[PDB]
Amino acid sequence: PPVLDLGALGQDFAADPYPTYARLRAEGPAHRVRTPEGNEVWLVVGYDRARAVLADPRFSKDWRNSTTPLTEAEAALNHNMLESDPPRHTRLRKLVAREFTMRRVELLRPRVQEIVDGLVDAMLAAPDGRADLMESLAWPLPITVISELLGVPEPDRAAFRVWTDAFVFPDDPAQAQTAMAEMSGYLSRLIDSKRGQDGEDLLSALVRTSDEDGSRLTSEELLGMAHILLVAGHETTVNLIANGMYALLSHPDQLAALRADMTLLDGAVEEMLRYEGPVESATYRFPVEPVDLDGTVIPAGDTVLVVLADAHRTPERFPDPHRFDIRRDTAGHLAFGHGIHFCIGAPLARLEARIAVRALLERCPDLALDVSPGELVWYPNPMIRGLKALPIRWRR
Ligand code: HEM
Ligand SMILES: C[C@@H]1C[C@H](N(C)C)[C@@H](O)[C@H](OC2CCCCCCCCCCCC2)O1
């Protein structure tokens, strides 16, 4: 079977990838494709097989197992738990697990509520009663929360944001490299700036751990840890909030049901993850040996992407999959992954999204989508399902 070119689609494919994936899934679990940016990878589609591959230790996350070359700017940032296997994965994650439990995250609630209250205050001063929800709330909220956790000073954040866009959503390869190089230079200086300042933010704590014992946390791993916690804080929750509010505003009967009973809110947020989560495909996996998936054999070291999005539209697992239904049974969705790499930030992402959504509904009378769905534009990245903008309006 020939390599399918996703780039050739466009677009189209970036707005609505689902039929493309579902067509693949009818033929079987694994497919050689060429991403819009030009990388040859495997797609794993279909819920059951997606779930198994996510947790299967025959599929490594360590780039030493991959046959794909890394540039210097890329390699400098890959000593992090998401790009590791046990035992390194185990050791790195244990260093921060305690910061991200539900009970520790619950203590951030007053401060997350305050950040939301202020962003919405400012949004609602708009004289025309219109805004882009992404500029006004979905982007600044997660950024502010994770910046204050890690200790990124406020004046540094705007630059920081440009980099983390420039290489999550490139448009030009040399720019992505430059940004990675700069982000890495910045994080090193930030890290150095904490030494001997007795700060109590998370990065100051990790700096002390590393300086007390460089075999528990190396300086490369310390930079990798600040990087992964910050980027994940920049680019996932944003899209959960935007995509989810889009789902609600474009399914007016679900929005009303939720208005009528706000106790449905937690279950509505799960169905946002299930129906249109920010993660369209999981991060790279590399088979340590060749892996046979129903007669399709995947060679050692090839790149494998597990397609979360298609898993979530598998009718056998989620009946009536294309329906956004806030009361659906969402248990078992893969929006936060599955297995040893299951999202460490999930309690924090849920806290943010629940608060932001409830603030929008309670505070925006007759909240409306301010363009038709057909006018929205989706970024092309096949790992991310994300809008460029979400125009909303409300009654002023
Ligand atoms: C709605 C928001 C989020 C979604 C949908 C999400 C999704 C995911 C997924 C699918 C994975 C597993 C990747 C894989 O196995 O290939 C993951 C891992 C990870 N996420 Fe989240 N994420 C979100 C928010 C966050 C936040 C706010 C943080 C910051 C604390 C975070 C930090 C991480 C880290 C460090 C990992 C690697 C965990 C490991 O390897 O053990 N994520 N995320
Ligand atoms: C480690 C990988 C490398 C990749 N490129 C440099 C090739 C980058 O775009 C990706 O991160 C994106 C993709 C979203 C996946 C969601 C998982 C959330 C965990 C944090 C990873 C960064 C998130 C953004 O992180």
Curated annotation (Swiss-Prot):
Question: Which pathway, per its entry?
Answer: Antibiotic biosynthesis
Q: What keywords is this UniProt entry annotated with?
A: Antibiotic biosynthesis, Heme, Iron, Metal-binding, Monooxygenase, Oxidoreductase
**Bilayer-spanning residue ranges:** none
Query: Is Nucleus one of the keywords UniProt gives this record?
Result: no
Q: Does the keyword Iron apply?
A: yes
The annotated consequence of E74Q reads: Reduces affinity for narbomycin and YC-17. Strongly reduces activity with narbomycin and YC-17
Q: Which residues bind substrate?
A: 83, 176-180, 227-235
GO terms for biological process, alphabetical = macrolide biosynthetic process
Q: Which InterPro entries match?
A: Cyt_P450, Cyt_P450_B, Cyt_P450_CS, Cyt_P450_sf
Phenotype when inactivated? Abolishes the production of methymycin, neomethymycin and pikromycin and leads to the accumulation of their precursors.
Q: Which domain of life is it from?
A: Bacteria
Q: Which family does it belong to?
A: Belongs to the cytochrome P450 family.
**Protein name per Swiss-Prot or TrEMBL:** Cytochrome P450 monooxygenase PikC
Where does this protein come from, organism-wise?
Streptomyces venezuelae
Gene designation per UniProt: pikC
